[PDB]
Amino acid sequence: VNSFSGYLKLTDNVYIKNADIVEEAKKVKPTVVVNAANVYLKHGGGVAGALNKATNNAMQVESDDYIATNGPLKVGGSCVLSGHNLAKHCLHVVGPNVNKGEDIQLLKSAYENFNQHEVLLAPLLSAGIFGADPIHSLRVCVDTVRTNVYLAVFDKNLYDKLVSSFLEM
Ligand SMILES: Nc1ncnc2c1ncn2[C@@H]1O[C@H](COP(=O)(O)OP(=O)(O)OC[C@H]2O[C@@H](O)[C@H](O)[C@@H]2O)[C@@H](O)[C@H]1O
């Protein structure tokens, strides 16, 4: 469980590896995988789609059940659903969607949810479909999260860019 290998240490609690998050979840057996979600837990085309695919759509049903009972999340919030065959738990976290005019400051609120979990495997919130700059998302991650976060960046060119950007310390 939580057997992370091959990561680059960026800070005492932020680690980064060039890897697909769904394949890492399977090799590492993490307690908490982070989904980059929207407030209706409708799992579209990024990390959320891939996690859902790997659970054979179980995440989507469970999500709708959760949404039916509880209603939609706030931007910058989270919920703890099941991780199914990927992890013990899946932390659904809703970053701001800047393509839809939401406030980038809420990215800090989004990453604060990580601090309720000792250890997580996560992607870079809001950095794909939601339109935030990956480098910014990484900066907020570094400055906000205090627990152990292992970041999976599947694009080798973005990994290289991200690391180079972090060295402007
Ligand atoms: N399989 C993957 N593994 C690792 N990183 C990934 C993967 N797919 C995408 N990424 C990276 O994770 C970051 C977040 O991308 P998204 O998943 O699109 O996250 P976000 O921008 O928060 O989009 C939220 C929206 O996407 C929908 O899937 C979701 O339902 C919500 O509507 C980006 O750097 C993206 O390149």
Residue numbers in the entry: 3 to 171
Reported in the publication:
In this study, we determined the crystal structure of the SARS-CoV-2 Mac1 protein bound to ADP-ribose. Our crystallization experiments resulted in the same crystal form (needle clusters) from several conditions, but only when ADP-ribose was added to the protein. The structure of SARS-CoV-2 Mac1 complexed with ADP-ribose was obtained using X-ray diffraction data to 2.2 Å resolution and contained four molecules in the asymmetric unit that were nearly identical. The adenine forms two hydrogen bonds with D22-I23, which makes up a small loop between β2 and the N-terminal half of α1. The side chain of D22 interacts with N6, while the backbone nitrogen atom of I23 interacts with N1, in a fashion very similar to that of the SARS-CoV macrodomain. N40 is positioned to make hydrogen bonds with the 3′ OH groups of the distal ribose, as well as a conserved water molecule. K44 and G46 also make hydrogen bonds with the 2′ OH of the distal ribose, and G48 makes contact with the 1′ OH and a water that resides near the catalytic site, while the backbone nitrogen atom of V49 hydrogen bonds with the α-phosphate. The α-phosphate accepts a hydrogen bond from the nitrogen atom of I131, while the β-phosphate accepts hydrogen bonds from the backbone nitrogen atom of G130 and F132.
Severe acute respiratory syndrome coronavirus 2 (SARS-CoV-2) and other SARS-related CoVs encode 3 tandem macrodomains within nonstructural protein 3 (nsp3). Mac1 is essential for pathogenesis in multiple animal models of CoV infection, implicating it as a virulence factor and potential therapeutic target.
